[PDB]
A and B are shown apart, each in its own frame.
Chain A
Amino acid sequence: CKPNFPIGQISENFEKSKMAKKAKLEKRRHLRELRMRARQTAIQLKLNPDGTMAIDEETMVVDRHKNASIENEYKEKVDENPFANLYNYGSYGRGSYTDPWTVEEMIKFYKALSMWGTDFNLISQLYPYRSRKQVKAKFVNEEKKRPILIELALRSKLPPNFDEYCCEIKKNIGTVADFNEKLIELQNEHKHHMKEIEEAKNTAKEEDQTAQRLNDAN
């Protein structure tokens, strides 16, 4: 009769303890559903025969709750069992579980670590929905387990096997534009629009000076 799970007597009111444990199986499971698919009201009026072109009393003001009411109505209605909202030390905290890395992504990583020295800025976009923090945690990870390939990444300071020319442009095909000076020309447009604004502002400053002098003499 081990200390792990003997069924041994009356055990009253465990049907909600059982099913909420069974219901947590799917709450963790549909997190795995979403990860794999991630990879891939003016004023109104009226025509009254008595009073033509009359304004109505009710639409003068807005309720601000009826548009919130319909938003609430197509929401899920759940009956709370006190065992669902269980909290532990791992609650209301940072972080998540990173997807364990693949051999497909290794050849996208070590070649990026062979060409560049260690440049986490552009690796972060290469892995489209991965973040800056855990690729740095992978960098410290691969020192400990494979201590010899980070040496080979350091030692190779030359053009590698020249297959990366597509991988040069595989990064450069997303939104093809000369960013070295296309960033300049719309920034020039940004200050051009501002150069309108002071002209629209300072001519509005001088119209104040002519009117406030006119009623002084009046």
Chain B
Amino acid sequence: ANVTRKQEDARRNPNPMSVKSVNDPSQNRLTGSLLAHKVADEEANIELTWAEGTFEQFKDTIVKE
């Protein structure tokens, strides 16, 4: 609900180039905890076909010693 509220902020207030650089050995980059949140918001959705079976899982285990 705050996404459209954030969207409408800059629409009422509209007020206004990607070149390489070099990794320097006296400077650091984000990693660890906050890097795992950058990778966990953008990945593939899977809508699971939820069932309730499980006798196939039962007897397959029974027949194996």
Q: Are B44 and A60 in contact (CB under 8 A)?
A: no
CB distance from B22 to the nearest CB of A (A): 5
- Which residue on chain A has the smallest CB distance to residue B35? A57
Q: How far is the CA of A43 from the CA of B20 in the complex (A)?
A: 8
User: Of residues 1 to 34 in B, which have CB atoms within 8 Å of A's CB atoms?
Assistant: 18, 20-23, 25
Select which of B23, B25, B43, B45 is within 8 A of A61 by beta carbon: B23
Q: How far is the CA of A61 from the CA of B19 in the complex (A)?
A: 8
Q: How far is the CA of A43 from the CA of B25 in the complex (A)?
A: 21
A-B contact count (CB 8 A): 28
Main secondary structure of the interface of B (DSSP, over half): loop
Q: Are A62 and B42 in contact (CB under 8 A)?
A: no
A54-95: CB near B (< 8 Å → 1, else 0) gives: 010100111111000000000000000000000000000000
Selecting from A44-52, A110-118, A176-184, A191-199, the interface stretch reads A44-52
- Which residue on chain B has the smallest CB distance to residue A43? B20
Main secondary structure of the interface of A (DSSP, over half): loop
Q: How far is the CA of A176 from the CA of B21 in the complex (A)?
A: 49
Select which of B18, B23, B38 is within 8 A of A55 by beta carbon: B18
B contact residues around A61 at 8 Å (CB)? 20-23
- Which residue on chain A has the smallest CB distance to residue B21? A61
CB distance from B19 to the nearest CB of A (A): 9
- Which residue on chain B has the smallest CB distance to residue A48? B42
Interface range for B: 10 to 19
B contact residues around A43 at 8 Å (CB)? 18, 20
A contact residues around B42 at 8 Å (CB)? 48, 50-51
Q: Are B23 and A49 in contact (CB under 8 A)?
A: no
Q: Are A62 and B22 in contact (CB under 8 A)?
A: yes
CB distance from B18 to the nearest CB of A (A): 7
CB distance from B21 to the nearest CB of A (A): 4
Q: Are B23 and A64 in contact (CB under 8 A)?
A: yes
Q: How far is the CA of A48 from the CA of B41 in the complex (A)?
A: 13
CB distance from A171 to the nearest CB of B (A): 50
Q: Are B20 and A60 in contact (CB under 8 A)?
A: yes
Q: How far is the CA of A48 from the CA of B45 in the complex (A)?
A: 12
B residues sitting closer than 8 Å to A (CB atoms) are 18, 20-23, 25, 38, 42-45
**23 pairs, A vs B, C-beta closer than 8 Å:** A43-B18, A43-B20, A48-B42, A49-B44, A50-B42, A50-B44, A50-B45, A51-B42, A55-B18, A57-B38, A60-B18, A60-B20, A60-B21, A61-B20, A61-B21, A61-B22, A62-B20, A62-B21, A63-B22, A63-B23, A64-B22, A64-B23, A65-B23
Closest 9 CB pairs of A and B: A61-B21, A63-B23, A64-B22, A62-B22, A50-B42, A61-B20, A62-B20, A61-B23, A61-B22
